[PDB]
Amino acid sequence: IRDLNELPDLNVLYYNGARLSLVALASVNTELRSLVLNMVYSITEGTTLILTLIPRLLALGYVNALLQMQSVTREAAQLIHPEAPMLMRRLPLYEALVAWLAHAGQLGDILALAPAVRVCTFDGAAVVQSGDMAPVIRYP
Amino acid sequence: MITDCFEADIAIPSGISRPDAAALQRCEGRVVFLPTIRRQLALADVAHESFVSGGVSPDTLGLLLAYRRRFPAVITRVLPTRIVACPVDLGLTHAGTVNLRNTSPVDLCNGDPVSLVPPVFEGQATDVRLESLDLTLRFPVPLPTPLAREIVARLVARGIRDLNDLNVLYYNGARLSLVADVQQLASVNTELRSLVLNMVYSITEGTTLILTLIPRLLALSAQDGYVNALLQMQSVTREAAQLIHPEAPMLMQDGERRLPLYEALVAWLAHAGQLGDILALAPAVRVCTFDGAAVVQSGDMAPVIRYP
Amino acid sequence: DHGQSDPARPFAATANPWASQRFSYGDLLYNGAYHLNGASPVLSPCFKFFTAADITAKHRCLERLIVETGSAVSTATAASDVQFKRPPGCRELVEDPC
Amino acid sequence: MDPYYPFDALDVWEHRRFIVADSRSFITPEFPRDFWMLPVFNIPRETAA
Amino acid sequence: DLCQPNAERAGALLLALRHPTDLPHLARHRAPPGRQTERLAEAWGQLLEASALRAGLVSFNFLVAACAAAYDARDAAEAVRAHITTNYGGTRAGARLDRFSECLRAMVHTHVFPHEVMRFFGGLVSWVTQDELASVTAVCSGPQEATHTGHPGRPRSAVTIPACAFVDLDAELCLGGPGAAFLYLVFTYRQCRDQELCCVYVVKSQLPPRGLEAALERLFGRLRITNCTYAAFAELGVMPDDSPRCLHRTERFGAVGVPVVILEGVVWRPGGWRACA
Amino acid sequence: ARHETGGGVNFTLTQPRGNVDLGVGYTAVAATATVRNPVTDMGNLPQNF
Amino acid sequence: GYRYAAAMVPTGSILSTIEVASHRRLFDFFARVRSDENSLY
């Protein structure tokens, strides 16, 4: 996202006291660009349906008092901080939640990265290093 | 076997006319919701009479919400005295291969997960009624999950219109519409509450860094055919940037030691990526036919592997 | 106790004031109790001289003490590059006069 | 005459044994405030003067 | 250092840990602005200097007394603390207790949460100790009661949990219907300015894991108002009985009797964690 | 004890035993004869705190 | 607590039959076994 206008850090990860280098880059930024165009899009049509529906209803019963008290300096401040550099025929406001939930539930299956494999080592090392082989089960 | 299967047994009552007995043997692989994981139950606990609330029958949008408070079990063999069913939530079989049945008008592909849905379609609400026992049975409909995410997305969105068409789908070139029906306003308020809690929690201080990049997108969807095919004809961001020029706060509170965008993505996945599972129920089942084909057609059995 | 003689060489109380006495210069550094250099992996040889906890702990049986100082467990390691305090896991039986 | 507050109200669940970060509340009587009279000090009939 | 398979008998939970040197760097980034990033680097640094008086292990009964200052009856939360300072291998484990709980109270403040570190390891079947270390054997998947314990004189082992962490949900909601019962680990968080508590609970229920967070809204919405994650749970295993069976005895951990809930016939199936911001 | 890994199958064998030392008083002596390579170079390496 | 190996050869037999849990107060050591427990062996 930061190449689409980076950071001093975020090229560095630590795991098991060991350093990772995500840089090792011009191909990678072209490679993963289609996730970026879907992650940028799914938030922008996400956070503009909220911004166009909370001022639409503020439903009066208990949903009104529960929301803005929980959105007190959390979203109601963030609404007017967005609506400072924003604003408030017929807009197709209800036909887009269908198109948004279908897209947002589509990336949830992708970016979940479900584990297919668990590791129950027996008579061996608790840590399997790079290049070595690890015993693999997933069923009890 | 106790850990491998778990053969939950619905007992059939005594007085059954042989037509109503021959109806249940036609329900070999169906989906049956259990309230507990007892090994001894009765059809009265399964059927629609156990499903109805106090005084009020639930509509289709509430019929989802009392599925996810139960245990989906697949019938495996209908004996003359009882019904054997295996719950999905524990573990499917020894070898892990259960035969379902497409009650849907929609075929499946291999590797499609299977989310199940009430009889929402038109000309489809088929309830096997046992007149000798006075029991109807709502057998739900297995679907490929991008239909089951869109079918639940049509029912919530129609419910907000009644707080002040949409009922037409397409899937593999087949036009299919679902039943337009009156909705209980008590049930729609639960779905309405689950949006506002889950969408606001996905908003973080890093999201306003992202909303500055909206005029980049409309500058970019005029160049890529990919992004021009991405936004939509019916998008909102194309309208909320031609009226709106956003800008960010230029410096952040301790913005160097912490990552403002990275926490926005993680918070977004935990609330908006999850959101398709919060409204509907989970796809705990997929299709891996061994040697037949890529596609199991409608009305035909499909083998099943456990699926997270 | 520096109001007393020295069991080794009784006619004096100590060879150094700067070391012997509690809160001397030395004990401030090398008492494992104060836990000063505990960070660094490098062995500190004198750690067993100034550490008050150890000596007070050991029993006084001579029949017993002998048998153990054949099997005593070294504080150092022989796989070290420079020299190291022993990793918590490993053990080497090394007979200690000291 | 309503005192100023930043927040309206909230709905929170609290278990008995697991209470953490304890707090306290405020007490109002059980009779209607029409029976809770305005404060009065009787000035004595005469002054030491 | 931290766990003792010697003092704790066969049939307790075990919780594995990550590597400890990633802790002082990840606190510098995940912390919200206005909190002390250099608290976890010094609180953990005074436990390596307290346990010397490396992905190790922490057993379950050791962890109860550290979070004992945030449990209500508190009579049996102090009974857990009684047998730890007197029976665990290590000089002043109670000094480690007020340090490892200070490590735990440094977890929540520095935003590196303790549920992201604790990993379920199996239940105790046998353990072989030595100087400074032990070879712990466990059951990462399967039932409990029929394991080759190692001693063919006693090839049995039952699961024991102290009564401050054991929370039913069938009696509290009048759910008297029989059926198979599930087991869950539950953490509670409490984010306040230098008033932070920890609690470890082991919840038994007949509920689906999809139908669990509503119950965490019901009991643990109290800390939700003060807190935006407030709970973090994980599956533990299944009681396969149509009538799940519990017992309530006071076993003797050395010379101290602690009220211990006995679970019977547990089939271990692990799972993952969950956040609820 | 049969516990399979790596596609293989492991057989671990164990023979439990016991030892009592039935001598009273010292029954064994260990004398040190010679000296091989002194391991640590006897150097001058100062310490850094 | 109770020696089973002596039960394989009883001294005499109990001729009266009553649900025993009622009189639990009367006994030093008492146990109910549903079918079989793994301790017997």
Helix, coil or strand: residue E102: helix
Cα–Cα distance, E233 to B108 (Å, whole number): 34
Cα–Cα distance, E243 to E250 (Å, whole number): 23
Residues of D whose CB is below 8 A from A66:
10-11
Cα–Cα distance, E129 to E118 (Å, whole number): 23
Residue D3 DSSP label: P
Cα–Cα distance, B23 to A46 (Å, whole number): 47
Chain CA centroid to CA F45, Å: 30
Cα–Cα distance, E62 to E53 (Å, whole number): 18
Cα–Cα distance, A85 to B214 (Å, whole number): 12
Q: Under an 8 A CB cutoff, do A140 and E268 touch?
A: yes
Chain CA centroid to CA E123, Å: 12
Of the candidates B203, B216, B277, which has its C-beta nearest A78's C-beta?
B203
Q: Under an 8 A CB cutoff, do E72 and D11 touch?
A: no
Q: Enter the tokens of residue E154.
A: 């006693």
Q: In one letter, which amino acid is E56?
A: G
Sole residue written with tokens 């129950």:
A120
Helix, coil or strand: residue B305: strand
Exposure of E268 in the CB half-sphere (CA atoms within 13 A): 22
Chain CA centroid to CA E164, Å: 11
Q: Under an 8 A CB cutoff, do A70 and D8 touch?
A: no
Cα–Cα distance, A3 to E200 (Å, whole number): 43
Contact E270, E140 (CB under 8 A): yes
Beta-strand relationship, E57-59 and E14-16: antiparallel
Q: Under an 8 A CB cutoff, do E222 and D10 touch?
A: no
Residue G38 at interface with chain E, using a CB cutoff of 8 Å:
yes
Q: Under an 8 A CB cutoff, do A96 and B236 touch?
A: yes
- Nearest by Cα to E168 from E218, E205, E216, E127: E205
Cα–Cα distance, A54 to B195 (Å, whole number): 11
Cα–Cα distance, E87 to E252 (Å, whole number): 12
Those of residues 1-40 in D touching chain A at CB distance below 8 A are 6-11
Residue B152's CB: how many other CB atoms inside 10 A? 22
Q: Enter the tokens of residue B192.
A: 């309405």
Could you write out the three-class secondary structure of chain C?
CCCCCCCCCCCCCCCCHHHHCCCCHHHHHHCCCCCCHHHCCECCCCHHHHCHHHHHHCCCCHHHHHHHHHHCECCECCCCCCCEECCCCCCCECCCCC
Those of residues 33-62 in A touching chain F at CB distance below 8 A are none
Contact A2, A8 (CB under 8 A): no
- Nearest by Cα to A47 from E118, B137, E206, B202: B202
Of the candidates A74, A97, A108, which has its C-beta nearest B276's C-beta?
A108
Chain CA centroid to CA F49, Å: 33
Contact E222, E198 (CB under 8 A): no
Cα–Cα distance, E82 to A116 (Å, whole number): 43
Q: Under an 8 A CB cutoff, do C88 and E133 touch?
A: yes
Helix, coil or strand: residue A46: helix
**DSSP string for B110-137:** TT-BEEEE-S-BTT---B--BTTTTB--
Helix residue spans in E154-266 (DSSP H)? 213-219, 222-226
